[PDB]
Amino acid sequence: DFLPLYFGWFLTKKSSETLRKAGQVFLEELGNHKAFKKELRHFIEKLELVSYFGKRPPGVLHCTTKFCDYGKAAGAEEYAQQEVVKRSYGKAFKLSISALFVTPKTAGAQVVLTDQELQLWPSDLDKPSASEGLPPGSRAHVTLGCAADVQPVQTGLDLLDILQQVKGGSQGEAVGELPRGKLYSLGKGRWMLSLTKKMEVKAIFTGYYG
Ligand SMILES: Nc1ncnc2c1ncn2[C@@H]1O[C@H](CO)[C@@H](O)[C@H]1OP(=O)(O)O
Incomplete structure (x- = not known):
């Protein structure tokens, strides 16, 4: 038996719609913001970011736990065999999004996982060098878009990098108020919105087979 391409939480029609x-x-708001227009040189008339991030999920949004490549990825067998994954397979979850973000490479939403959902977050031996210093599960995100040259993989790395700055106290003071939250400028083309109300999205834990 081969494993899926990846496991993860797949958001319902309605919830994918809300987040998207x-x-x-x-x-549209970040691209229209004074603070963004000024720093556009450190990013790339106005730039239309919806177009810039041209490579979008074409259907339902998802939050990836463990990329398996059908069993070719390190730790895939390990992950899929866990009681918690088999038990959770096909179960419904509510995910909490705390922030939307943008970099020159990706646009995503930061997921904050409950301890129950953390039981489903992988515990691999090959771990990212930007992951360290952050709790397990900090990589948890939903990808919203990518630049032409970029793989949707980059979104997770982009998120860790951004939070590696937050834990360093390197976010600074907010440079704007969008209707949903406070806008921050991390530099190096990076932007974070901390949502006033975290949005709850509904999702099913299952496997995606390409
Ligand atoms: N090398 C890798 N490590 C972890 N996840 C990967 C990966 N390569 C691709 N992916 C994930 O597999 C999917 C490919 O259809 C992408 O959505 C991406 O998830 P992501 O959106 O969370 O970044």
Whole structure:
């Protein structure tokens, strides 16, 4: 038996719609913001970010736990064999999004996982060098878009990098108020919105087979 391409939480029709709509409003707003227009040189008339992030999920949004490549990825067998994964397979979850973000490479939403959902977060031996210093599960995100040259993999790395700055106290003071939250400028083309109300999205834990 081969494993899926990857396991993860796949958001319902309605919830994918809410998050997608919310990510796309952020993009028109960030692209229209004075603070962003000024720093556009450190990013790349106005730039239309919805177009910039041309490579979008075409259907339902998802939050990846463990990329398996059908069993070719390190720790895939390990992960899939866990009681918690088999038990959770096909179960419903509510995910909490705390922030939307943008970099020159990706646009995503930061997921904050409950301890129960953390039981489903992988515990691999090959761990990212930007992951260290952050709790397990900090990589948890939903990808909203990518630049032409970029793989959706980059979104997770982009998120860790951004939070590696937050833990360093390197976010600074907010440079704007969008209707949903406070806008931060991390430098190096990076931007974070901390949501006033975290949005709850519904999702099913299952496997995706390409
Ligand atoms: N090398 C890798 N490590 C972890 N996840 C990967 C990966 N390569 C691709 N992916 C994930 O597999 C999917 C490919 O269809 C992408 O959505 C991406 O998830 P992501 O959106 O969370 O970044």
